[PDB]
Amino acid sequence: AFQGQAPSFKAEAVFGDNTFGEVSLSDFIGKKYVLLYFYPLDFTFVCPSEIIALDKALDSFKERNVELLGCSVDSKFTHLAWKKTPLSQGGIGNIKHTLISDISKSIARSYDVLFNESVALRAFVLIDKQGVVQHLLVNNLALGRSVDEILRLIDALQHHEKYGDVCPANWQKG
Questions:
Q1: Which EC numbers does the record give (predicted)?
Q2: Which amino acids are annotated catalytic?
Q3: β-pairing, 10-14 with 20-24?
Q4: Which of helix, strand or coil describes residue 172?
Q5: Calpha distance 112→101 (Å, rounded)
Q6: Which of 12, 35, 110, 168 could be disulfide-bonded to 7 (CB atoms 3.0-4.6 Å)?
């Protein structure tokens, strides 16, 4: 599955800008670590605690050189319309990180988080600067409440890339 290159993609996107544009996973190789997350739909009656919890912590991600990418099977036009909708009225307001649009459902599928050919299941996927998946968080660990664990795994990941694992010390080949 996913362990070598994370399943690539080229998707339409709404930026912080509220600009439209295209994004490819590969645009981040050797630039940024990527935190790709999935949610079912835009405009539902379930508060988007994950998108907001993440956007509210954006600076923590930038400081660790992490690019946030929110994905739902919705089109780029409805993401935009959802950003132009105040929290007070069920929207996400003006979030400052990019949302991408999985309108063929292909991305959700490649990551095995497509629920009965309809919407994506909630998931947090951390990808390094070489495009290798470091973790998948789902179900009860895939909540807006999870932001601090996420940042913690990123610190551990970056610490592991720097120093490597450590031996039981007492153990030897031979």
A1: 1.11.1.15
A2: 47
A3: antiparallel
A4: coil
A5: 16
A6: 110
